[PDB]
Amino acid sequence: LKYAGVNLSGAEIKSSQKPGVLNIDYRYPAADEYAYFAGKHMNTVRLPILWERLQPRAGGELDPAQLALIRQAVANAKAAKMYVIVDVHNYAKYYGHTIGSTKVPISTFNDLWRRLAIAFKSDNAVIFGLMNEPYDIDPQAWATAAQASIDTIRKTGATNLILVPGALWTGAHSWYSTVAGQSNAVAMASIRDPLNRYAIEAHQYLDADSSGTSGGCVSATVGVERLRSFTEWLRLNKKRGFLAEFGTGNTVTCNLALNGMLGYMESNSDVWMGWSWWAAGAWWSGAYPFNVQPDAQGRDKPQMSILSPRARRITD
Template identity: 50%
Template structure:
C-alpha cells in the first residue's frame, strides 16, 4: 500500500489535483468513550476500570456485551495542518515553508460545534538536537496556539507528524533510541501537563518497523509523560500506518490487535488512535470511495477489538471527496461511531488549515462559504 508524502511547498496550487499527496498524512484508519457534555475536561474525569491484562488477540465477538466505561467527552474535530509542511527544508522558514494556524482560526470550527483540534507539527523543528532543549521560537508558536485554542474551550491533540522517525531514522534505531523519544515527551509533558484540555498524541502513523519496537517506544513515551505527573489523555497509534482496516493484519509484522495489548499506562487514561480513508487502498490519495458501506466495513473489526478488550479508540484521520458515494460512506461511518460510543472517543477530519487551496478534502471555509464536506459533518456536531 502506498501513502501520502508531505507537501514540500506552501503554494496550494500544488493541491489542486485530486491525486496529489496529502500534507503530512499517511492514510489508513480510528477512536472510544460514552458521550457526555462536549468540552468537558477529559483528565478530570474519574479513571476507568483497570484495563484488561495483555492476552492473545481474539477476533471481535459480535455477541459480547459492551464494556462499561466511565463517561467521557466525545471529541469531534479537525486536523489543522501547516506546521508539518516543508519537511525537505528543515528547519525551514516560518510563514514561507510552513505555518501554524492563526490563534483565532479555531473559531470557525468551534462555532460549527467542533471541540477538538489535532495539531500536526515536526519533531525536528521543535527539537533540533535529540535529548536537548526544545527550540524556543518553535515552542512559543506551539504554546501560543494551544493557549488560545484551549482558552476558548477547544481541546488540542498534539501530533508529532513524523511516522516514528526523526530525520528519517526510525525510533528504536541506534540513531534515534527509544530514550530520545521519551525525552521529547517528557519535555512536552512538562510544558502542557497543567492544561487538561491538551491531549498527547504520541506519534503519527508508525510504519516499516516491527510492531514490538513501536510498542516498546510507545511505552517509553507514556512512562516519561506520567513521570512528570501529567494526567492528560494520551492517544497511541498502531504500527502499519495505524489503519483500522489492517488492525488484525500481519503484513507489517505482529498484528496491532495482538501487540498493542502490551501498551500500558499507569495513568489509565489512554486512547488507541487509528486512521481510515475510503479509497481503494485506504491511503487517502484519491477523492473516490469504494462504496457507501466501505467505511463501516473497515472500522467494524477495530470496534469489536475495542469492545472485547475494554479499550477506547479515536479516529484520528478520515476524509472523502465531494461525491455522493463518499458522502454516504462518511455519514455511515460517523453513525457507526455514534452507535458504538462506548468504544469510540471521537474523531478528527483530515484536514483544515490556511494553505489548502482547492485540496479536495479541505474543510477550511472559503469566501463563498462552507466546504461541502462540512455539511456532511454538521449533523454529528450537535
C-alpha cells in the first residue's frame, strides 16, 4: 500500500452552473487544508474537478484559469509532500451526454486526457483519475473508451499512474453485476496499459445498498465482505486496486467495519495499492456523516482517529 488519503470535494459541485463562479458556486482547497491532512499522515488528495469547467468545448483548449487552479492544487499538495489524483468527476458524461454517443464520441474524451497528460506530463505527484463512476454506459463500451484514453495518455509520453474505473458506479461489491450480460469482471480483464502503470479504481460504501446515502453500516465486517470477491478478481487478473471512494458514519459498528476494511487492504497489499476517504472539503454541511474536515476550532472529526493511524502505517 503506497497511497492513503482523502477526497477534497469542492471544485465539482453545483454542476448545473457552467462555467460557474469561483468561490460562489465552487472552490478549490486552501493550501493549509493539505498541511492538515499531511499532519494526519495522509499522503494523497483526490481532487474532483468538472470536465466542463476545465474544457468548456469539445476538443478545445483547456480553460486557462481552471488549469491554473489545478496547478495550484498540485503545488499546494507538493508543499505538504502529498500526491494529487486529478478526478474528472463526470459519470462518463459531457454536458449530460454519455461518452460513445454520437454527440460525445470517444475522440472527445481522448482529447481531454491528451491535454491533461501534456499539462502534467510525467510529474510523479500527479495521478490521472480517468473518470468518476461511469454508470449508464455498459461495461464493455466503457472499457473500450477507457482503453482509448489510456492509449492516448501513453502516446504523449506521460508516465503517470492512471486510475481506471469500471462502469456501474465502479462498485467493488458489484464487479460481477451485469448490464445485458456485460460486467466489469469481463470488460476490465482485458484492459492494458502500454507503460504498465495503472490500477483499477473501485468505490465502496457500507450502508444498506452500498450507495453511501446513509451514515450507518450493515455490520462490523461488511467492508471486508464487500471487498473480498473484487480482491481475488484483482489477484487472478494480475491487477492492482485503488479504493478511491469509501466512507462510514460515526457509529460503533461503522468503526469496527472501517478498521477491518483498512486492515484487510494492508493484509492484501499484493493487489491493493491505495485508498482515499470520501470526503473532506470546507463546504460540507454539519449533518454530512462522512465529513472529516476539521471543525471551526480545528478539532479532528471522529473517524480520523481510525484513518490517521492506518494512514501512518502506509506513509511513515
